[PDB]
Amino acid sequence: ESQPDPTPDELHKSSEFTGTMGNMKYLYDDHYVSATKVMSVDKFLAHDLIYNISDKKLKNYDKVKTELLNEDLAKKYKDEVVDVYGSNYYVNCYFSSKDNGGKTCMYGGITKHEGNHFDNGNLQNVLIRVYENKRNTISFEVQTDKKSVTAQELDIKARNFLINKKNLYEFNSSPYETGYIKFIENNGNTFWYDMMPAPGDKFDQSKYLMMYNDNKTVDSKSVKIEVHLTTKNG
Ligand SMILES: [Zn+2]
């Protein structure tokens, strides 16, 4: 059932990352694709869905392709009226089955619209407890209008806050060596994501965001979230 917590040696270390940390910051700093009540209009590969979603802010795209874990998930949502929320990227983002208004890519981030909102039309607050060197230092709430929300949406909102409040990610590096965000569902199931880039000198945005392809959702009203960081080394 539950994924065991991170073993000490498996967590990505920022001291072992030689690329530009600002490329990780870019994915969570007031950065996200949003849409309500849309239906896919095309596909590229068997596991992805393309939607007509325009960029309200910077006007950088009008088409969004989201890749999912497998063909089953893609077929499930293909003709569904859904809402979308996720982190997009442009580097190594391609369409055209031959030759197939900007375009952008993402992973998962989709939920059915019908029956997924609160009866009184209010927003649900989700508590995020932050731990620094095993000590709970601060806690803050993020908001969502979805009863069943993708873990991706909550993670993004959490990191956006931490970037501003705790300088989670900066241009060169991070004041933290290690970091992971853990979700705890009211059924006892737990899972986590490594918040640091893979070792090396070149951050691969597409490959990192791929972890959201399972389109994992949680109950916003009951889920618990813990962010565990370490400055550990120094
Ligand atoms: Zn909706």
Curated annotation (Swiss-Prot):
The entry's free-text remark on the cofactor is: Possesses two zinc-binding sites. The zinc ion is necessary for the toxin interaction with MHC class II.
Query: Which Pfam family, any one of them, does this sequence belong to?
Result: Stap_Strp_toxin
Q: Name one GO molecular function term.
A: toxin activity
Sites binding Zn(2+) 2 sit at H47, E71, E80, E114
Cofactor(s) in the UniProt record: Zn(2+)
User: InterPro entries per the record?
Assistant: Enterotoxin (IPR008992), Staph/Strept_toxin_CS (IPR006126), Staph_tox_OB (IPR006173), SuperAg_toxin_C (IPR016091), Superantigen_bac (IPR013307), Toxin_b-grasp_Staph/Strep (IPR006123), Toxin_bac (IPR006177)
Binding residues for Zn(2+) 1: D9, D83, H113, H117
- What's the domain of life for this entry? Bacteria
Q: Where in the cell is it found?
A: Secreted
S-S bridge residues: C93-C105
- State how changing H47A affects the protein, per the record: About 30% loss of T-cell stimulation
Q: Name one GO cellular component term.
A: extracellular region
How would you summarize the oligomeric state and partners of this protein?
Interacts with host MHC class II molecules composed of alpha/HLA-DRA and beta/HLA-DRB1 chains.
For this chain, the family text in UniProt reads: Belongs to the staphylococcal/streptococcal toxin family.
The protein's name:
Enterotoxin type C-2
Q: Which gene encodes it?
A: entC2
